[PDB]
Amino acid sequence: XXNXXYX
Amino acid sequence: XXNXXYX
Amino acid sequence: XXNXXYX
Amino acid sequence: XXNXXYX
Ligand SMILES: *[C@@H]1O[C@H](CO)[C@@H](O)[C@H](O)[C@H]1O
Ligand SMILES: *[C@@H]1O[C@H](CO)[C@@H](O)[C@H](O)[C@H]1O
Numbered sequence: 001x002x003n004x005x006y007x
Numbered sequence: 008x009x010n011x012x013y014x
Numbered sequence: 015x016x017n018x019x020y021x
Numbered sequence: 022x023x024n025x026x027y028x
């Protein structure tokens with residue numbers, strides 16, 4: 001990761 | 008809000 | 015984004 | 022003010 005979310 | 012990110 | 019805030 | 026925006 002490294003991005004965020006939430007999915 | 009309620010979503011996340013990060014932008 | 016493009017909106018503002020703050021939430 | 023105190024809120025943000027932008028309008
Ligand atoms: C990103 O979100 C995860 C899940 O809640 C968390 O473990 C990290 O601390 C946070 O930075
Ligand atoms: C973003 O939201 C996640 C999930 O609740 C949390 O773990 C992080 O600390 C927050 O920055």
Ligand SMILES: *[C@@H]1O[C@H](CO)[C@@H](O)[C@H](O)[C@H]1O
Nearest residue numbers: 017018019020025026027
């Ligand atoms: C939020 O956006 C306004 C408008 O561009 C800027 O003046 C602020 O510094 C920023 O926090």
Ligand SMILES: *[C@@H]1O[C@H](CO)[C@@H](O)[C@H](O)[C@H]1O
Nearest residue numbers: 018022023024025026027
């Ligand atoms: C809020 O946005 C205004 C307009 O750009 C700015 O003057 C403030 O510095 C900022 O905090």
Ligand SMILES: *[C@H]1C[C@](C)(N)C(O)(O)[C@H](C)O1
Nearest residue numbers: 005006007008009010011
């Ligand atoms: C992150 C926040 C969210 C998008 N509202 C969710 O609860 O649906 C997701 C599972 O976690």
Ligand SMILES: *[C@H]1C[C@](C)(N)C(O)(O)[C@H](C)O1
Nearest residue numbers: 001002003004012013014
């Ligand atoms: C959230 C995580 C990210 C997408 N990697 C970023 O660091 O670019 C952003 C500023 O914050």
Ligand SMILES: *[C@H]1C[C@](C)(N)C(O)(O)[C@H](C)O1
Nearest residue numbers: 019020021022023024025
């Ligand atoms: C932006 C301005 C605000 C709406 N007054 C707040 O302080 O509550 C928020 C956290 O940030």
Ligand SMILES: *[C@H]1C[C@](C)(N)C(O)(O)[C@H](C)O1
Nearest residue numbers: 015016017018026027028
């Ligand atoms: C703040 C950002 C915005 C909502 N995109 C706008 O450019 O329309 C407004 C004038 O300023």
